[PDB]
């Protein structure tokens, strides 16, 4: 059980990566069209939701 | 064991959120290029796997 | 236990196919634009976490 939930938290790794992956590329689209200031909010709750995300990652360690 | 499968549990409760987040981006943008038609497929598998993690989240539960 | 931890390695499956959904749109709207060449490392990057992302998959199972 142990060895498996430490999988199942590094399955959760990798896919943060790749949802910031997903988050800068929409972004680049996003600056290729104008300034970001109206994505401001959109910034702040990605930024709250990483935050939670890397707490739940250090405390699952 | 328990009260680490609750914390990845609500790791991936975060993450759904920003999935969501970056779902609302992205058609944020492909409005701004105009209709989304093109994309009524796309909109309802992403609605069904949602669906999806809902379920799983509340049987989790 | 056990089938606890079944559910939330399904819940990582479904926001797998979620991920590859938000990806596929990203890469629509990066070719609406033009070539995508610039986005040849973002490609790589995405590519990998998600080799480890199944091989983790793989292995949970």
Redesign the interface.
Known sequence: ??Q??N??????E??????Q??????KQ??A??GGRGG?ME?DR??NN??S??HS??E??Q
């Open positions: 059980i142990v498996q939930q999988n199942l938290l590094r399955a959760i990798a896919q943060q990566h790749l949802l992956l997903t988050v800068w590329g929409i689209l996003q290729a069209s994505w959109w709750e990605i939701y990483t939670l995300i739940l990652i405390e699952s």
